[PDB]
């Protein structure tokens, strides 16, 4: 089990060798610059924002959603009626003698129904994503993934969405509640994740049992 | 699923500065708050019980 | 469903500055507050019980 | 997986300075909060129980 | 029961793509206004 | 159950490579602007 060959999360070499510097030019200057890579115009006082494809942005995942509903109804009805002639005078005998009019009835009806539902979800974290598209109005499509492996499994946190540039703070951060089409995923693998899956028979029963 | 429906007639001068009017200032106010799903069916009387509630002697 | 119906005759000088008048200043005030559904049918006497309440000797 | 869907019509003058508007200022607000997975299937009535809740005499 | 297909409360697409802006006119003004409504 | 292939919520690549900048024009200005939108 532990001897099965596996591919590590961080593949390839984990170190890099420095490349020896370019040969200095014989011009009479001490200042020698390596082959420049121009990164274009960069504003001086403007806050550092992602502007092009490949730029990075910090998303502060802070989700707190809670909805609830409940209702009930009831109805009741109770009715009792009675009449009794304990002593009947003679002139009334033919109309009320032999308990001819004595009667007693009762009835009841009751109903009580109720129902309700509620859902909630929270999410807290921080993830750095990359801009992979700039829209026609300047909004930036951002995607990002973080993979952490601790001991006996691997967890993935994936984020996607669309960010308005003016919602990004001065520290290159935007809360996750300001992203339009926010797709947030937090999953894992290993036997820890398989221990949180229903058995196939139990799922079959949960979906097809009469109750 | 729950539905809240409102209908009525509003006097323009009763509307506040924040574009709001209380429901007690609407002339022909029709207010409805209903739902569906098994929660709503659990609040309906059975047909036999309704029949008895309407036709029982007591 | 519940229905609240009102009818009457109002003197114009009894209406306040906020376009309101208490119901005790309306001449021929007809006020009705009724409902339907099984809740309302649960508050109706059975036909036999009503017959007894109207025709029983005591 | 949980889905929160929103739809509606927004008046531009109700939007605040921070590009925010409360959900009570949206005209035809459609709000949905649903989910899937065995957690969601555990909150569905069995077919026999639903049949009884809809067709039982009481 | 939970596998029965259903129509969601909010039907249709849940996102909209921005339409690219109109071509600016060659008049010597920076201010260019979209087709007013 | 856990071995059944599934499509993740966030599909596609989760990273983007920066595109190398445009070649600067030989006009005598340091300020070079990308193709404006």
Curated annotation (Swiss-Prot), chain A:
GO cellular component: bacterial-type flagellum basal body, distal rod, L ring; cell outer membrane
Keywords: Bacterial flagellum, Cell outer membrane, Lipoprotein, Membrane, Palmitate, Signal
Positions of N-palmitoyl cysteine lipidation: 1
Topology term for the membrane: Lipid-anchor
Keyword Signal: yes
Protein family: Belongs to the FlgH family.
Protein task: Assembles around the rod to form the L-ring and probably protects the motor/basal body from shearing forces during rotation.
Full protein name: Flagellar L-ring protein
Species this chain originates from: Salmonella typhimurium (strain LT2 / SGSC1412 / ATCC 700720)
UniProtKB/Swiss-Prot annotation, chains E, F:
Membrane-traversing stretches: none
Disulfide bonds: none
Location in the cell: Cell outer membrane; Bacterial flagellum basal body
Lipid moiety-binding region (N-palmitoyl cysteine): 1
Residue numbers with lipid attached (S-diacylglycerol cysteine): 1
Subunit structure: The basal body constitutes a major portion of the flagellar organelle and consists of four rings (L,P,S, and M) mounted on a central rod.
Similarity field: Belongs to the FlgH family.
Protein role: Assembles around the rod to form the L-ring and probably protects the motor/basal body from shearing forces during rotation.
Protein name: Flagellar L-ring protein
Portion of the full-length sequence here: 22 to 58 of 232
């Amino acid at each position: 089990c532990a001897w099965i060959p596996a591919k590590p999360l961080v593949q390839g070499a984990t170190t890099a060798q420095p490349i020896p510097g370019p040969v200095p030019v014989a011009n009479g200057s001490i200042f020698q610059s390596a082959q420049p890579i121009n990164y274009g115009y960069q504003p001086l006082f403007e806050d550092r924002r992602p502007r092009n494809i490949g730029d990075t942005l910090t998303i502060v995942l802070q989700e707190n959603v809670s909805a609830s509903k409940s209702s009930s109804a009831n109805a009741s009805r109770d009715g009792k009626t009675s009449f009794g002639f304990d002593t009947v005078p003679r002139y009334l005998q033919g109309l009320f003698g032999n308990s001819r009019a004595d009667m007693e009835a009762s009835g009841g009806n009751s109903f009580n129904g109720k129902g309700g539902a509620n859902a909630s979800n929270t999410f807290s974290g921080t993830l750095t994503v990359t801009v992979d598209q700039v829209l026609a109005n300047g909004n930036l499509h951002v995607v990002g993934e973080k993979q952490i492996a601790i001991n006996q499994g691997t967890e993935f946190i994936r984020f996607s969405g669309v960010v308005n540039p003016r919602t990004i703070s001065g520290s290159n951060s935007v809360p996750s509640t300001q992203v339009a089409d926010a797709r947030i995923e937090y999953v894992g693998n290993g036997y820890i994740n398989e221990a949180q899956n229903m058995g196939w028979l139990q799922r079959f029963f949960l979906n097809l049992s009469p109750m």
